Specification:
homodimer, c-terminal domain of poly(a) binding protein, 5 helices, 70% helix, BH3976 protein (chains A, B), unknown function, left-handed superhelix fold, structural genomics, joint center for structural genomics
Amino acid sequence: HVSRVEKLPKDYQIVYKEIQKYLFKVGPVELNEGIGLLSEILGFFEEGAAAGKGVLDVTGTDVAAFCDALIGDSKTYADLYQESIQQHVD
Amino acid sequence: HVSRVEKLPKDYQIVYKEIQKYLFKVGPVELNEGIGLLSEILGFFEEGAAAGKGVLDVTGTDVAAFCDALIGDSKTYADLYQESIQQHVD
């Protein structure tokens, strides 16, 4: 078995590696929120591939601007976190 | 500010809610890996929307089968986790 990152087309992998570096430097500092963000970007990329898009058609040429639009807050993480607890009750 | 989940088209939100329930019952039990998986599915959905796809064009009609293909292992989480540490050095 292998990481789904390794299953991306090569172009997508190159841009993902740029992304990991960037987000480390400007994204959430916390390990878990950091991986949540990365996981999310990975899914953009996976659906991009499946849709027959080139990576820059997903991010645009300004990849940092793409990342920046997902870091504006942590409401998204917070939602997913709170929902999982509400369930773990179940 | 609001969760990006709330910014999805309504059809995508409906299928995401089905997904949260399903994954809770069959997905990783661990809180963090669970949110990582959810984050990833969310990105599939976000790129689906941006690409002009209907949700079932992203998941297929067998939504449980879609979820099942992302739960076959945790190599993907493990990768993202190990990479973040290697960096937090930096």
